[PDB]
Design a protein around this ligand. Sequence first.
Ligand SMILES: CC(=O)N[C@@H]1[C@@H](O)[C@H](O[C@@H]2O[C@H](CO)[C@H](O)[C@H](O)[C@H]2O[C@@H]2O[C@@H](C)[C@@H](O)[C@@H](O)[C@@H]2O)[C@@H](CO)O[C@H]1O
Length: 240
Amino acid sequence: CPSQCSCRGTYVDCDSRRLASVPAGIPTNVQILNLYNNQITNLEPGVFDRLVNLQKLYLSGNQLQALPVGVFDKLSQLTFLSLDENKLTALPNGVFDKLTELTYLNLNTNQLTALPEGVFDRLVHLKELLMCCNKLTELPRGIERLTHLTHLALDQNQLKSIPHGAFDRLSSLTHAYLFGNPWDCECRDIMYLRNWVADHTSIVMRWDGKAVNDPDSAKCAGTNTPVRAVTEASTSPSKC
Ligand SMILES: CC(=O)N[C@@H]1[C@@H](O)[C@H](O[C@@H]2O[C@H](CO)[C@H](O)[C@H](O)[C@H]2O[C@@H]2O[C@@H](C)[C@@H](O)[C@@H](O)[C@@H]2O)[C@@H](CO)O[C@H]1O
């Protein structure tokens, strides 16, 4: 066990300990590594490579701007990965490709403007995908294939519409967060999202410290009228 952390079995608790780097003594038997709420600013190239039994990795609440290429590649058992509340400005190509068992991925509250091509394509088992509070300007391509999703968080980005049909195979969704985006309701491309929200009112959620059902929380930029109240005649294909 690392000097400044506490280990109970295969649980290594390094949370809330003002760590400026990943600590040296992490046991090879670790299954849950909790590094939440520290001041870690980078990961060294092969830091997790020996931690082959990891199931859950909490990197929430740190100061990461980037990740080393291949940093998660040896974590073949990983099911849970949180990277929320860092300041990631990009992800390396293929960063999640080896994480075949992942069911939970949290990228909330970073500085992402775009994701690598096909970044989620290998994550066939994903049930929860959270990427609120970034600077995304379009829906990451490939999300439409993630048919086992129950939770999808896209709130508080810079999204203006959703590509036609993108949510149609996501038939297991129970929680979809869409608020806080500048939806472009003047453009006729908004109509798919309008129709989809209106057809799925019970799963669209806002966040009052917790999930709250509210289909009107997806709102039009400028007017702050509900997206589902948009009429086709109020839109034009020449305003896109
Ligand atoms: C690893 C983990 O559980 N992290 C939690 C975050 O995912 C939570 O963020 C909130 O997540 C929901 C979707 O599940 C939604 O995207 C919320 O908008 C999001 O909250 C945002 O981020 C928070 C830190 C606040 O800034 C909030 O005002 C934002 O709207 C947070 C919720 O506190 O808890 C983490 O533990």
